[PDB]
Enzyme design. Structure first.
Site, PDB file in Angstrom:
ATOM      1  N   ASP A 296       0.946  -1.102   0.000  1.00 48.93           N
ATOM      2  CA  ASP A 296       0.000   0.000   0.000  1.00 48.93           C
ATOM      3  C   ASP A 296       0.995   1.160   0.000  1.00 48.93           C
ATOM      4  O   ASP A 296       2.180   0.946   0.259  1.00 48.93           O
ATOM      5  CB  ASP A 296      -0.792   0.006   1.309  1.00 48.93           C
ATOM      6  CG  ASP A 296      -1.511   1.314   1.553  1.00 48.93           C
ATOM      7  OD1 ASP A 296      -2.348   1.699   0.707  1.00 48.93           O
ATOM      8  OD2 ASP A 296      -1.245   1.956   2.598  1.00 48.93           O
TER       9      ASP A 296
ATOM     10  N   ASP B 135       0.289   5.002   1.143  1.00 46.43           N
ATOM     11  CA  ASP B 135       0.113   5.922   2.259  1.00 46.43           C
ATOM     12  C   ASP B 135       0.100   5.293   3.656  1.00 46.43           C
ATOM     13  O   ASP B 135      -0.748   4.455   3.976  1.00 46.43           O
ATOM     14  CB  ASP B 135      -1.138   6.756   2.004  1.00 46.43           C
ATOM     15  CG  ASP B 135      -1.064   7.490   0.673  1.00 46.43           C
ATOM     16  OD1 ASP B 135      -0.183   8.364   0.521  1.00 46.43           O
ATOM     17  OD2 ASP B 135      -1.862   7.174  -0.232  1.00 46.43           O
TER      18      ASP B 135
HETATM   19 MG    MG Z   1      -2.305   3.108   3.704  1.00 46.56          MG
END
Ligand code: MG
Ligand code: MG
Ligand code: MG
Ligand code: MG
Lengths: 209, 210, 208, 208
Positions: free
Chosen positions: C40, C42
């Site tokens: 992922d 962020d």
């Molecule tokens: Mg994230």
């Protein structure tokens, strides 16, 4: 609660606002001060005495705390069951430090007073306290034949008092002296555990053992 | 570091450093009855997580070193807009609010270099809703070697308390004989290594890393 | 109460979480041929709160509508990550996978934009060789885009790293290994998730 | 130094250990028919240091030689456990296994004596039903005894709980599930072991 509660970094790093101190910091704060009288509560402060209280409850009051009022229990507890009491390492460090300073060490307890007692010997032996610094255990209480904890702290002019319970700390505050908290072990049979630091007092780090 | 499964034990899990932790409520309580006074705040890692701008500055001006910190071009950018990327700390919000309620005069004393213009003062007033009556333009003390630039300012403004995350913030307060209180520097700050909060026996505010 | 105090039971209390280190993860993959793994973006490999913070202050001070503002995403995906702080935990994980020769993919729920410099910022900050690097994948519910799950299956990702619950459930839904990364306490994306909430492995000290 | 201080990275630092709760262990056994499970005794189900402390002070105040004194064991196995404090964590585990209908076994490394009242003390303090209770097993290297591993295999135990490394390795050697219990910080058996040193599951808050 929940099966997989998980956690987060805010919770992992969260700190209670407590004033922690080390034995080394306490010693440094006494530098230069002449010998003085200091006091220690006994149970869960210098001795993990739960073994004896556990056996007393099992024997005299399996369903309650009535054993604490049974004279038979106290005869056993103050005359031999402390052979099963485990001395605390934090206490050992504090006593060794006060002994090097030449202070007079007193032990004040809320245990019921019996005609004879071997607790004083157990303590002097376990902590190797020199004769000149050792004093017979003091049983404080309400009986007209005895004085209260506050009265003894004042009579002996103790300047510091160490203890694990709230009443040990408030006694020191009432006399206007330095009360220092010792952490009660998680496996002590005396529960719930108290909230160390609840009076803004200094709490000794790692003093649960 | 080289042990695959180091494990742990309960003595280690319950181990505490001998630090004097305090909460905002306790600080406030210790000031009851005290009339309005001047108090000071360091900026970076104290009231603002400003690493974003310092990180961009380093990458732009000196990828391999800290020379950017002496570069006039960096300070111009940092003090006139890059704080739009700086995240306010919640611990600071609570302290500033408390001091505003007391009617205290608030000062910000930073080690950042002074530039011709700066928008930091406005960013602070806006983000923390500081009334004009309590606000004071930011004091850019700069940073000189072998000397603590903040001492002069704490003295002249008669600041009674100074909050900071670095050792030099605490020693400045100690040099003036005033109350220096430590704020924890976030673990993701680019200013490393993290300092040892409580290294001077000072009070440290709990959960002040965010 | 001004002085709540504490006790040793509270001081040593532990949440029942399965913690792991990068070294343990690496050891668990010994002898395994190079594979595809995903991250992922962020709060997993980048602390991007600086841009999201400025975005909210600029486009929707009182709400999260900025997340719907194409103007915001143009700025966010094309330069504001120069203010994003790379995570040390990610650095360690990425270096480990590169050494293994694994194929690294980045899957994000950020809105897609005509152009983006995020892939470049990632390859640069983490020194990812071209051989292991792959352009960022933007997932979503749009008709022109596949969801997170579909992307994990299509690339046959065997491990997926993320800080959010949906990162872990996506992995769970694909029958692969989902590993949690801690979200920093100063992230503007609150509240923090409960790492370990699905009985998944959580990487120690991964908040930075 | 007098004021060492600390920092937030240190305050949140976690060791990479696989922690579990009694509830999670119970959940993992959902659907499984009754089975045999074993428990180490000292520092696992009983805080027996009071007796070991008195024995040391009595027979060898400056060493652990008392552990090989027959006089010590006679008293330790026939009454000194009246001073041993049962562990809350063990109580929960035992109640959970009794509810499942599992057979409970206690395997100890204590020296075997002609008679013993440990079995009685355990059954009473933990209210173990006659149908789930089994006499304490004294394992050892003597020709008249069987080793801990042989006993686990003999009774077909599927899980073994213990605080020491040898408790975990025994389970590992049998191919069964070894789960670690935390030894209390005030136990006289030092140093404390490193729970998790074998990548085994460790029960949270099991020090009391
Ligand atoms: Mg994230
Ligand atoms: Mg006490
Ligand atoms: Mg600073
Ligand atoms: Mg054991």
């Amino acid at each position: 609660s929940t099966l997989n509660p998980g956690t987060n970094v805010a919770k992992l790093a969260e700190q209670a606002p407590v004033h922690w101190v080390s034995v080394a910091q306490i010693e440094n704060s006494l530098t230069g001060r002449p010998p003085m009288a200091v006091g220690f509560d006994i149970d869960d402060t210098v001795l993990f005495s739960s073994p004896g209280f556990w056996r007393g409850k099992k024997t005299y009051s399996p369903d309650s705390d009535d054993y604490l009022k049974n004279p038979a229990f106290w005869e056993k507890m103050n005359n031999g069951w402390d052979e099963f009491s485990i001395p605390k390492e934090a206490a050992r460090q504090l006593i060794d430090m006060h002994v090097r300073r030449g202070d007079s060490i007193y032990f004040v307890t809320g245990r019921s007073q019996t005609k004879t007692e071997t607790v004083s010997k157990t303590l002097a032996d376990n902590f190797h306290i020199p004769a000149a610094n050792m004093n017979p255990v003091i049983f404080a209480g309400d009986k007209p034949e005895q004085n209260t904890k506050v009265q003894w702290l004042q009579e002996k002019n103790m300047r510091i008092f160490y203890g694990d319970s709230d009443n040990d700390i408030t006694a020191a505050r009432d006399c206007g002296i330095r009360g220092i908290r010792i952490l009660r072990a998680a496996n002590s049979t005396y529960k719930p555990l108290p909230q160390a630091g609840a009076f803004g007092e200094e709490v000794i780090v790692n003093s649960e053992y």
